[model samples]
Target: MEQLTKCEVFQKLKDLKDYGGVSLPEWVCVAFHTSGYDTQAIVQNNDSTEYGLFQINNKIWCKDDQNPHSRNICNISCDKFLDDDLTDDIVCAKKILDKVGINYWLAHKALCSEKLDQWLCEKL
Candidate 1:
């Protein structure tokens, strides 16, 4: 399985947070779920809802063989999720959660759209 250092993971989260903006959670979760995470599997197969970092596509997971450790970033982010930086997590998580709703699962369902994107404030 591929792995990233804590710094690499944080940088990716930060980048994901930046790009995800108000829709960070779902996108991040989608990235993980599609990328190869099994939290989604539990949600669909067992009617569970607690998802991983982003809370991904649960139904499709059981279809594929999960190399739970595939992303490596998931492990890092999950660890970070617990205690790395609540400020960062909350900062980004709140934007998505608030704009979406306190009901993340519902928000997740409702928020999947192309409009959930960053406004190009300045072109590089």
Candidate 2:
């Protein structure tokens, strides 16, 4: 597990730039609040668990190997989202954004909605 700098997070996200419908900067902010850009983050989310950089959850978007019964719309094991290569995580995050909306991310209502540009190139 590694904690990415804001710039590294921004650069990797730039590689996934095609999924920028909701503004990359907004997600940059969300990623900061969610896990501080750590790829190997796993947090206990009440009844379920959240994994990886975006805090993607189990029982819905991914299957929890430890606790089974997940809808797994992203068709991936939750652990896959915890690697240094975030290509899979970003894709699933985009799938989540496409199926629902950016509001699915709690940070959207908190620190991400306004003045998001501050994170755009904060470390670019």
Candidate 3:
């Protein structure tokens, strides 16, 4: 799994900007803080697992066979979120932001206290 650079992550969100009612920079910030822009990032909890760039957990957004009871709102298998192509992940993240809110990602919440555009991006 390839870890996307900050600039690349920024561009991905920017291209997908075509809402969360959240600013573009804020979304970029979420990706960096939550998954470190790693598409394959996965965090395991006792009964649930967070998957993909947005760290969407299996409890609600995606399905994990390890846990049959997952309420898969995203309508996609968890493994699909681990791949490089972010089309599905982007849609799911948007759904999360719209339905579950930004608080769903703890890292994303903390990032709101500061400026998101810190000149942190380097041109690719």
Candidate 4:
């Protein structure tokens, strides 16, 4: 999956505001901080697995073949989160936001939680 530009990522996130009910800039920041907009990002947290632009975890959020015990709250293949196509990722993100808040992502809380102007500055 090719990386999306900041402008492209911002637009994609903004368009999802109506669907996720969160600030688009915040989501953009989340995406940026998570994988620096790399669609193929796959990170391992010690032993736990996280994937895609949002880094949805395989422990409790999505299923990874390596972890057969995943609850798969998103009810989709973990591979779906790896593609450049963000539809599945967005759907899962929306579900996560609905259950918890944007703070569900530690990166969002630590990096994007304050003075969001920079995240939305491109909009001005």
Q: What is the C-alpha lDDT profile of model 4 across 13-88, one tens digit per residue?
A: 6557645545777778788887899888888887678888888888778998889899899998788888878888
Sort order, lDDT high to low = 2, 4, 3, 1
Q: List the residue pairs that clash in candidate 4.
A: none
Model number with the top TM-score: 2
The true-structure Cα RMSD of candidate 2 reads 2.1
lDDT, candidate 3, equals 0.78
Instruction: List residue ranges in candidate 1 displaced over 4 A.
Output: 16-45, 48-55, 60-124
User: Residue pairs in steric clash, candidate 2?
Assistant: none
Estimate, for each residue in 1-124, the C-alpha lDDT of model 2 and write its tens digit.
Answer: 6999887888888755546455677778878888988899999977789999988899789987766778899989999988898888988998888887777667346568688768876544
TM-scores for all candidates: the values are 0.24, 0.86, 0.85, 0.82
The whole-model lDDT of each prediction reads 0.37, 0.81, 0.78, 0.79
Candidate 3 Cα RMSD (Å): 2.3
For model 1, what is the C-alpha lDDT against the true structure?
0.37
Which pairs of residues collide in candidate 3? none
TM-score of 1: 0.24
Candidate 3 lDDT score at position 25: 71
Worst 10 residues of 2 by lDDT: 14-23
